[PDB]
Amino acid sequence: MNLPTAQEVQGLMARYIELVDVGDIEAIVQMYADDATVENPFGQPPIHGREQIAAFYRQGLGGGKVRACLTGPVRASHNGCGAMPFRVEMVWNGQPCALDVIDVMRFDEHGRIQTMQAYWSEVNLSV
């Protein structure tokens, strides 16, 4: 595809959450541009490229039974960007915890995630 329309952004960002929810690391990595930048959480140094992104997601979505779901609609722009609210459920010290997150994404002219910023901090975690 080309630079995603607002409707296409909604579709792509919702698909991303579906992939996080099932934990398909390889499928998530393929949604990213080969040289994408990820800031997660926003405020920490960016990581870069699909190798680093794969390592990041495998560490995050490997062991525990992670779930993820949108908690409101995707807000999309007309310049290939969007933002969405979601909740991530994960098991910590064998305790179920939930994390509220907002992801902002910019897509490239091929429909892959060029940049993403994940807004959250410890205030957004519930043990």
Distance of CA 46 to the CA centre of its chain: 14
Is the CB of residue 75 less than 8 Å from the CB of residue 83?
A: yes
Distance of CA 92 to the CA centre of its chain: 20
Spatial separation of the C-alpha atoms in residues 17 and 46, rounded to whole Å: 20
Residue of the chain from 49, 75, 97, 114 that contacts a second copy (CB under 8 A)? 75
H or E element: which one contains 50? helix 49-61
* Binding range to a second copy, per CB under 8 A, among 26-34, 57-65, 73-81, 88-96: 73-81
Spatial separation of the C-alpha atoms in residues 84 and 13, rounded to whole Å: 8
At 47, is the secondary structure helix, strand, or coil? strand
114 belongs to the binding site for a second copy (CB under 8 A): no
104 belongs to the binding site for a second copy (CB under 8 A): yes
Residue of the chain from 15, 65, 78, 110 that contacts a second copy (CB under 8 A)? 78
Site for a second copy in 9-28 (CB under 8 A): 10
Site for a second copy in 43-62 (CB under 8 A): 43
4 belongs to the binding site for a second copy (CB under 8 A): no
90 belongs to the binding site for a second copy (CB under 8 A): no
Nearer to a second copy, 46 or 49 (CB): 46
Is the CB of residue 13 less than 8 Å from the CB of residue 84?
A: yes
Tell me which residues touch a second copy (CB under 8 A).
Answer: 6-7, 10, 41-43, 71-73, 75-79, 81-85, 100-102, 104, 119-124
